[PDB]
């Protein structure tokens, strides 16, 4: 009989809920009632990116704030020059089904993955004029959905097998395996200190993990639908989460509870990108209504609307220095937005 | 523009030129999706033409075909079924001998209904391949068909039994006006299956050929 273990599991869950309620005394909306509102924010597409022949599924910003890498279903990885719009590289891909792409912090490697269950690492600083695949990370039985670079040698990967893995480039083996997710994990984001990273799965939950020991500390709940996007706050003690349900939720690594939700009645679509700004005041959320609304992180107010896409927006990232914001949609176009 | 800046611009134009050439080749290739349920004769159909998903390429009458075997993903279907939007047709494989083995046919019907009423495939033609007909004739002579369908009223023959199964799969679509479903029976020694796929995609090519003409 295993019902005795279930009974004590429910008691532990009740204790967790009771602890969250005790620590909750004031809503983030109430404490920020004396802050001057931002007002209205207008962003214009300074540069549009042309050259993709299929829907764009992922895009990542380099650490130099100039180089952009975009992944599409056409099977081509393109390294874009944001300032000058020219294409630095065009890496052919063995598998045309790509769901995620990563840029190394040092800029010498580019990662890609998709339905082939393989995280291909491409060497972008070859002596030759071409870019080869340095490693083909294999071992995942589920579709790759998000991969991020800890450093030039360590790369984390979230796949459709409901398990996240830490990969070693030199040996091509899983150093640590993250288990505990019932549903397949879609999106992940690394903390600024690289020691932590959150994972969002279809089980309507987000989990905090440790790189060193490969164990889960906190499980975040509150979403009524599956999680599609999740990003870390600039500070590192918080993180926002996106879901198919038209709502954005902000959690803390210390309070271990939701503070304020970002939702509207006029919106009923899904969320694909939740990337934060540099200062963390602005929350940019990509949606399925061809729109990328601007959310005030401290007030859940509508400060601006980013429109101009003819299809669903699938990727959205903020550059390292926060100067400009790039948005990629299924219309095979990437738009870089800036203020005036 | 500087000396090296102009050189970078020229490289981008050459990169764009190569990208356009590859896209023209891709636009001339027919994409097909294989969505069989529970290994319902996936091997026999694939071998008749000419690790995660399997990419199968074959050419028939100067037309290149791309077939994807995505049934081995074993994950959330709705999280990657949108990547197959715009596909020319969907090839469905259902074994006729699985009705005698929470029935296996009901599992195929549930997955068929999921993709026939899917938003991403609201106009994609479906090619239903009812394979393993050789064993169906032998099985129908020793096992009644009423096990799978309690509402069946016909006899234990084969021609009427096959029509009833085909009819059941043809009433699972709520968009019959805008989407057509093709049904075929394939045996072990059959060799005309590739022609039927070619015939099915010709109609799809017809629909999208006059779409650029401003007719639909």
């Amino acid at each position: 009989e295993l019902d005795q273990l279930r009974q004590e599991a429910e008691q532990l869950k009740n204790q967790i809920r009771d602890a969250r309620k005790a620590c909750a005394d004031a809503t983030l909306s109430q404490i920020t009632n004396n802050i001057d509102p931002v007002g209205r924010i207008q962003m214009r597409t300074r540069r549009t990116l042309r050259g993709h022949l299929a829907k764009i599924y992922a895009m990542h910003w380099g650490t130099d704030s100039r180089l952009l890498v975009s992944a599409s279903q056409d099977g081509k990885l393109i390294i874009w020059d944001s300032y000058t719009t020219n294409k630095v590289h065009a890496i052919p891909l063995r598998s045309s089904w790509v769901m995620t792409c990563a840029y190394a912090p040092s800029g010498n490697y580019v990662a890609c993955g998709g339905l082939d269950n393989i995280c291909s690492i491409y060497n972008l600083k070859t002596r030759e004029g071409n870019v080869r695949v340095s490693r083909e990370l294999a071992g995942h039985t589920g579709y790759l959905s998000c991969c991020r670079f800890l450093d030039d040698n360590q790369i984390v990967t979230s796949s459709g097998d409901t398990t996240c893995a830490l990969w070693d480039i030199e040996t091509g083996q899983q150093t640590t395996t993250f288990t505990g997710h019932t549903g397949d994990v879609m999106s992940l984001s690394l903390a600024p200190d690289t020691r932590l990273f959150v994972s969002g799965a279809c089980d309507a939950s987000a989990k905090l993990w440790d790189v060193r020991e490969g164990m889960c500390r906190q499980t975040f709940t509150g979403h009524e639908s599956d999680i599609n996007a999740i990003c870390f706050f600039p500070n590192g003690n918080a993180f926002a989460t996106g879901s198919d349900d038209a709502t954005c939720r902000l959690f803390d690594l210390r309070a271990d509870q939701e503070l304020m939700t970002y939702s509207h009645d006029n919106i009923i679509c899904g969320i694909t990108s939740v990337s934060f700004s540099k200062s963390g005041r602005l929350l940019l959320a990509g949606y399925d209504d061809f729109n990328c609304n601007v959310w005030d992180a401290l007030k859940a107010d509508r400060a601006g609307v980013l429109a101009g896409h003819d299809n669903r927006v699938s990727c959205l990232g903020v550059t390292d220095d926060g100067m400009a914001v790039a948005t990629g949609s299924w219309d095979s176009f990437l738009k870089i937005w800036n203020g005036s | 523009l500087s000396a090296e800046d102009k050189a970078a611009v020229e490289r981008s134009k050459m990169i764009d030129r190569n990208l356009r050439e590859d896209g023209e080749k891709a636009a001339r290739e027919v994409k097909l999706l294989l969505l069989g349920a529970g290994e319902s004769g996936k091997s026999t159909i694939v071998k008749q033409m000419k690790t995660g998903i399997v990419e199968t390429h074959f050419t028939f009458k100067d037309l290149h075909f791309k077939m994807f075997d995505v049934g081995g993903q074993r994950s959330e279907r709705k999280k990657w079924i949108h990547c197959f939007e715009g596909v020319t047709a969907i090839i469905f494989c259902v074994a006729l001998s699985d009705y005698d083995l929470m029935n296996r046919m009901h599992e195929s019907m549930k997955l068929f209904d999921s993709i026939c009423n899917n938003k991403w495939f609201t106009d994609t033609s479906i090619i239903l391949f009812l394979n393993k007909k050789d064993l169906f004739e032998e099985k129908i002579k020793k096992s009644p068909l009423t096990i799978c369908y309690p509402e069946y009223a016909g006899s234990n023959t084969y021609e009427e039994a096959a029509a009833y199964i085909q009819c059941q799969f043809e009433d699972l679509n709520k968009r019959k006006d805008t989407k057509e479903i093709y049904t075929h029976f394939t045996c072990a020694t059959d060799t005309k299956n590739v022609q039927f796929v070619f015939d099915a995609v010709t109609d799809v090519i017809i629909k999208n050929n006059l779409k650029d003409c401003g007719l639909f």
Partner: single-chain antibody
Framework: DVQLVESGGGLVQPGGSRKLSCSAS????????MHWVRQAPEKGLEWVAY????????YYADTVKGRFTISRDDPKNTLFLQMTSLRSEDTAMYYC??????????????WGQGTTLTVVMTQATSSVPVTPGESVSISCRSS???????????LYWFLQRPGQSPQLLIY???NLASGVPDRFSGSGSGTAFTLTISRLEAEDVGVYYC?????????FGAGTKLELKA
């Protein structure tokens, strides 16, 4: 590894014609822009011709314009340079240099061995006495402001050890080339440039050649030899 072997040298009578075949092996010749640089005996370097990756864009030196014709064969990975009406000043060692848009610049990273042919941007004193273990600084000057509107200064530093092909050290006067020690460094302000070396070694003896990649018309420097003290 990366190799660039040239052939087609020897004794050429004045007014004749000859062709140089710089064979390419170990790298993608199709995506690499190629340059021709000649070095007169006991003299410096001077740019001759350049061909882009797609052969669409080709420039030429003023002294060799029209008389010299260049071509490339991407499938055969071989670079050609046919010459017409060779003069007395055309005798030099011709090097084929592969250039690619890399790190926001076009490094002259690899230089060929060269072949024997027989028929603005000033530098400091050609001879400077140096000793191992000491720091030596080499200065440079330009007739025009090499700084561009994009904030990039186009300066290239080259090392030509005796009995060896020139090797790139610093490109864009701020980024070290691949395979070079961290001792070398560069600085400047768009008109005056200096190169600083932390610690000298027995392999640092040679002639330092400066180069500008601003306009085309890349004018090399006279040279700076660092001989060992007695």
């Amino acid at each position: 590894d990366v190799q660039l072997v040239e052939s087609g040298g020897g004794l050429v009578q004045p007014g004749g014609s000859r062709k140089l075949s710089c064979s390419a092996s170990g790298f993608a010749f199709s995506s690499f822009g190629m340059h021709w640089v000649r070095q007169a005996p006991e003299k410096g370097l001077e740019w001759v011709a350049y061909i882009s990756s797609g052969s669409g864009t080709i420039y030429y030196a003023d002294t060799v314009k029209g008389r010299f014709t260049i071509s490339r064969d991407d499938p055969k990975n071989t670079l050609f340079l046919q010459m017409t009406s060779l003069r007395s000043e055309d005798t030099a060692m011709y090097y084929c240099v592969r250039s690619i848009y890399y790190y926001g610049s076009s490094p002259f990273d690899f230089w060929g061995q060269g072949t024997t042919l027989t028929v603005v941007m000033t530098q400091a004193t050609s001879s400077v006495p140096v000793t191992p273990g000491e720091s030596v600084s080499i200065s440079c000057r330009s007739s025009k402001s090499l700084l561009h509107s994009n904030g990039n200064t186009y300066l290239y530093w080259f090392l030509q050890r005796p009995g060896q092909s020139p090797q790139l050290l610093i490109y864009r006067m701020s980024n070290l080339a691949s395979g070079v020690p961290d001792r070398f460094s560069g600085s400047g302000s768009g008109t005056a440039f200096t190169l600083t070396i932390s610690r000298l070694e027995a392999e640092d003896v040679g002639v330092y050649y400066c180069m500008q990649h601003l306009e085309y018309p890349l004018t090399f420097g006279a040279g700076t030899k660092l001989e060992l003290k007695a």
